[PDB]
CSV table of C-alpha atoms and ligand atoms in Angstrom, one decimal:
chain,number,residue,atom,x,y,z
B,1,UNK,CA,37.3,29.5,-25.8
B,2,UNK,CA,33.9,28.6,-24.8
B,3,UNK,CA,33.5,24.9,-24.3
B,4,UNK,CA,30.5,22.7,-23.5
B,5,UNK,CA,31.5,23.0,-19.9
B,6,UNK,CA,30.8,26.7,-19.4
B,7,UNK,CA,30.7,26.9,-15.6
B,8,UNK,CA,31.7,30.5,-14.6
B,9,UNK,CA,30.9,32.4,-11.5
B,10,UNK,CA,31.5,36.1,-10.9
B,11,UNK,CA,33.7,36.9,-8.0
B,12,UNK,CA,32.6,40.0,-6.4
B,13,UNK,CA,34.5,39.7,-3.1
B,14,UNK,CA,37.6,39.7,-5.1
B,15,UNK,CA,40.0,40.3,-2.3
B,16,UNK,CA,38.8,37.5,-0.2
B,17,UNK,CA,41.0,34.5,0.0
B,18,UNK,CA,42.7,33.1,-2.9
B,19,UNK,CA,41.1,35.5,-5.4
B,20,UNK,CA,43.0,38.5,-4.3
B,21,UNK,CA,46.1,38.0,-6.4
B,22,UNK,CA,43.9,37.3,-9.5
B,23,UNK,CA,44.6,40.4,-11.5
B,24,UNK,CA,43.1,42.3,-14.3
B,25,UNK,CA,45.5,43.6,-16.9
B,26,UNK,CA,45.1,46.3,-19.4
B,27,UNK,CA,47.9,46.8,-21.8
B,28,UNK,CA,47.3,50.4,-22.8
B,29,UNK,CA,49.0,50.6,-26.2
B,30,UNK,CA,48.3,53.5,-28.4
B,31,UNK,CA,46.8,51.1,-30.9
B,32,UNK,CA,44.3,49.9,-28.4
B,33,UNK,CA,44.0,48.2,-25.1
B,34,UNK,CA,44.8,44.6,-24.7
B,35,UNK,CA,42.8,43.1,-21.8
B,36,UNK,CA,44.2,40.2,-19.9
B,37,UNK,CA,44.6,38.5,-16.6
B,38,UNK,CA,47.4,37.5,-14.5
B,39,UNK,CA,48.2,36.4,-10.9
B,40,UNK,CA,50.4,38.2,-8.4
B,41,UNK,CA,53.0,35.8,-7.3
B,42,UNK,CA,55.5,38.0,-5.4
B,43,UNK,CA,55.8,41.4,-3.8
B,44,UNK,CA,56.3,42.9,-7.2
B,45,UNK,CA,55.6,40.1,-9.6
B,46,UNK,CA,52.8,38.7,-11.5
B,47,UNK,CA,52.5,36.0,-14.1
B,48,UNK,CA,50.7,36.3,-17.3
B,49,UNK,CA,51.2,35.3,-20.9
B,50,UNK,CA,53.9,36.2,-23.4
B,51,UNK,CA,51.2,37.3,-25.8
B,52,UNK,CA,50.0,39.7,-23.1
B,53,UNK,CA,53.3,41.3,-22.6
B,54,UNK,CA,53.9,41.4,-26.3
B,55,UNK,CA,51.0,43.8,-26.5
B,56,UNK,CA,53.1,46.4,-24.8
B,57,UNK,CA,55.3,46.7,-27.9
B,58,UNK,CA,58.3,46.9,-25.7
B,59,UNK,CA,56.9,49.5,-23.4
B,60,UNK,CA,56.4,47.8,-20.0
B,61,UNK,CA,54.7,50.9,-18.7
B,62,UNK,CA,51.8,50.1,-21.0
B,63,UNK,CA,50.9,47.2,-18.9
B,64,UNK,CA,48.6,48.1,-16.1
B,65,UNK,CA,47.6,45.6,-13.6
B,66,UNK,CA,44.7,45.8,-11.1
B,67,UNK,CA,44.8,43.1,-8.6
B,68,UNK,CA,41.3,41.9,-7.6
B,69,UNK,CA,39.6,44.4,-9.9
B,70,UNK,CA,35.9,44.0,-9.2
B,71,UNK,CA,34.5,45.8,-12.2
B,72,UNK,CA,35.0,48.7,-14.5
B,73,UNK,CA,37.1,51.4,-12.9
B,74,UNK,CA,36.5,49.6,-9.6
B,75,UNK,CA,39.9,48.6,-8.5
B,76,UNK,CA,40.1,48.0,-4.7
B,77,UNK,CA,43.8,47.7,-4.8
B,78,UNK,CA,44.5,50.4,-7.3
B,79,UNK,CA,46.6,49.8,-10.3
B,80,UNK,CA,50.2,49.1,-11.0
B,81,UNK,CA,52.5,49.8,-13.9
B,82,UNK,CA,54.9,47.2,-15.1
B,83,UNK,CA,58.6,47.9,-15.2
B,84,UNK,CA,60.3,44.8,-16.3
B,85,UNK,CA,59.1,41.8,-18.2
B,86,UNK,CA,60.8,38.5,-18.4
B,87,UNK,CA,59.4,36.0,-20.9
B,88,UNK,CA,59.7,32.3,-20.1
B,89,UNK,CA,62.5,30.9,-22.1
B,90,UNK,CA,60.6,27.7,-23.1
B,91,UNK,CA,57.7,27.5,-25.4
B,92,UNK,CA,55.0,28.1,-22.9
B,93,UNK,CA,53.1,31.3,-23.2
B,94,UNK,CA,54.3,32.6,-19.8
B,95,UNK,CA,55.8,35.8,-18.8
B,96,UNK,CA,56.8,37.3,-15.6
B,97,UNK,CA,55.9,40.9,-15.0
B,98,UNK,CA,57.5,43.0,-12.3
B,99,UNK,CA,56.0,46.3,-11.2
B,100,UNK,CA,57.2,49.4,-9.8
B,101,UNK,CA,55.4,50.6,-6.7
B,102,UNK,CA,52.6,52.5,-7.7
B,103,UNK,CA,51.8,56.1,-7.3
B,104,UNK,CA,50.6,55.3,-3.7
B,105,UNK,CA,54.0,53.6,-3.0
B,106,UNK,CA,52.4,50.3,-2.6
B,107,UNK,CA,53.5,47.0,-4.0
B,108,UNK,CA,51.4,44.8,-6.1
B,109,UNK,CA,52.0,41.8,-3.9
B,110,UNK,CA,51.7,43.8,-0.7
B,111,UNK,CA,48.2,45.1,-1.5
B,112,UNK,CA,47.2,41.6,-2.0
B,113,UNK,CA,48.8,38.3,-0.8
B,114,UNK,CA,50.7,36.6,-3.6
B,115,UNK,CA,49.4,33.4,-4.8
B,116,UNK,CA,50.8,30.2,-3.6
B,117,UNK,CA,52.3,28.1,-6.3
B,118,UNK,CA,51.7,24.4,-6.4
B,119,UNK,CA,54.6,22.0,-6.7
B,120,UNK,CA,52.2,20.1,-8.8
B,121,UNK,CA,53.3,16.7,-7.5
B,122,UNK,CA,49.7,15.7,-7.0
B,123,UNK,CA,48.2,17.3,-10.0
B,124,UNK,CA,46.5,14.9,-12.3
B,125,UNK,CA,44.1,14.5,-15.1
B,126,UNK,CA,40.4,14.7,-14.1
B,127,UNK,CA,41.0,16.9,-11.1
B,128,UNK,CA,38.7,19.7,-10.6
B,129,UNK,CA,40.3,23.1,-11.1
B,130,UNK,CA,39.4,26.6,-11.7
B,131,UNK,CA,40.7,29.3,-14.0
B,132,UNK,CA,40.0,32.6,-12.6
B,133,UNK,CA,40.5,35.9,-14.2
B,134,UNK,CA,39.0,38.5,-16.4
B,135,UNK,CA,37.1,37.1,-19.4
B,136,UNK,CA,36.4,39.7,-22.1
B,137,UNK,CA,32.9,38.4,-22.8
B,138,UNK,CA,31.9,39.6,-19.3
B,139,UNK,CA,31.7,43.2,-18.3
B,140,UNK,CA,35.0,45.1,-18.1
B,141,UNK,CA,37.3,44.1,-15.2
B,142,UNK,CA,35.0,41.6,-13.7
B,143,UNK,CA,36.5,38.5,-12.2
B,144,UNK,CA,35.1,35.1,-13.0
B,145,UNK,CA,36.0,31.7,-11.7
B,146,UNK,CA,35.6,29.1,-14.4
B,147,UNK,CA,35.3,25.6,-13.3
B,148,UNK,CA,36.3,22.4,-14.9
B,149,UNK,CA,38.6,19.5,-14.9
B,150,UNK,CA,42.1,18.9,-16.2
B,151,UNK,CA,41.9,16.9,-19.3
B,152,UNK,CA,45.6,16.6,-20.3
B,153,UNK,CA,48.9,17.1,-18.7
B,154,UNK,CA,52.0,16.7,-20.8
B,155,UNK,CA,55.2,18.2,-20.0
B,156,UNK,CA,54.8,21.9,-19.5
B,157,UNK,CA,51.3,21.9,-20.9
B,158,UNK,CA,47.9,21.3,-19.4
B,159,UNK,CA,44.5,21.4,-21.0
B,160,UNK,CA,41.1,21.5,-19.4
B,161,UNK,CA,37.5,21.5,-20.3
B,162,UNK,CA,36.4,24.7,-18.7
B,163,UNK,CA,35.5,27.8,-20.6
B,164,UNK,CA,37.4,31.0,-20.9
B,165,UNK,CA,37.4,33.9,-23.3
B,166,UNK,CA,39.9,36.4,-24.5
B,167,UNK,CA,40.7,38.5,-21.5
B,168,UNK,CA,41.4,35.4,-19.5
B,169,UNK,CA,45.0,35.3,-21.0
B,170,UNK,CA,47.3,34.8,-18.1
B,171,UNK,CA,44.6,33.7,-15.6
B,172,UNK,CA,45.8,31.5,-12.9
B,173,UNK,CA,44.7,27.9,-12.9
B,174,UNK,CA,44.0,26.9,-9.3
B,175,UNK,CA,43.7,23.5,-7.8
B,176,UNK,CA,41.2,22.6,-5.1
B,177,UNK,CA,43.8,23.8,-2.5
B,178,UNK,CA,43.8,27.2,-4.2
B,179,UNK,CA,47.4,26.8,-5.3
B,180,UNK,CA,48.3,27.9,-8.8
B,181,UNK,CA,49.1,25.0,-10.9
B,182,UNK,CA,49.4,26.7,-14.3
B,183,UNK,CA,48.8,29.9,-16.2
B,184,UNK,CA,46.1,29.9,-18.7
B,185,UNK,CA,47.0,31.0,-22.2
B,186,UNK,CA,43.9,30.3,-24.3
B,187,UNK,CA,42.5,27.5,-26.2
B,188,UNK,CA,41.4,26.0,-29.4
B,189,UNK,CA,37.8,26.4,-30.5
B,190,UNK,CA,35.7,23.4,-29.7
B,191,UNK,CA,38.6,21.5,-28.4
B,192,UNK,CA,40.1,22.6,-25.2
B,193,UNK,CA,41.6,25.4,-23.2
B,194,UNK,CA,45.2,25.3,-22.1
B,195,UNK,CA,47.7,26.6,-19.6
B,196,UNK,CA,51.3,26.5,-19.1
B,197,UNK,CA,51.7,23.7,-16.5
B,198,UNK,CA,54.1,24.7,-13.8
B,199,UNK,CA,56.2,21.6,-13.8
B,200,UNK,CA,59.7,21.3,-12.4
B,201,UNK,CA,61.3,23.2,-15.2
B,202,UNK,CA,58.8,26.0,-15.2
B,203,UNK,CA,59.0,26.2,-11.4
B,204,UNK,CA,62.7,26.4,-11.7
B,205,UNK,CA,62.4,29.2,-14.1
B,206,UNK,CA,60.0,31.0,-11.8
B,207,UNK,CA,62.2,30.5,-8.7
B,208,UNK,CA,65.3,31.7,-10.6
B,209,UNK,CA,63.5,34.8,-11.7
B,210,UNK,CA,61.3,35.7,-8.7
B,211,UNK,CA,63.0,35.8,-5.5
B,212,UNK,CA,60.0,35.7,-3.3
B,213,UNK,CA,57.8,33.3,-5.2
B,214,UNK,CA,56.2,30.8,-2.8
B,215,UNK,CA,55.8,27.2,-3.8
B,216,UNK,CA,53.9,25.1,-1.4
H,301,K,K1,58.6,49.6,-1.5
């Protein structure tokens, strides 16, 4: 949701630095295309939300991912088709998506460097963070970095005061060190946006399920 802090910048050099694994997701269901975001976290693996993968209606092939998409049909790393989805077992709106190599035989986390996950030991309320992904109020498949502060950390949940819009589902939340601290899921109008906070349990889930995920 859009919040009083609406500080968003378009990333056009989407493959530079930490932005490269930020990924644009289209779930191409016959009923329509669900747009979302995600972050590549391993050679074959990206994180996004449960509600994003639910949009596949059980067909993981419906989920297409375009790391570092710059804009509409402008996908410097091509696209990848999901093959296996593992939802987080906890409440958090988090899902792991693994991709097959694409039709160019490349891997989603070889065409871009997977994100580095934070161990979140130093993450705290009031820290400046960004949530970077693919808001649906911007033009198709454009990446935007939205800036704000953590406002709430509780368990496996975080909230923040920065703005996002549908399309951002699954966007990585980055700290200042450009580590992923959480995975945005959405928000509550006029109140906050929120992410799954990658605390010890969620890190454990991720490490159990993604062999090459990198925590700092
Ligand atoms: K391969």
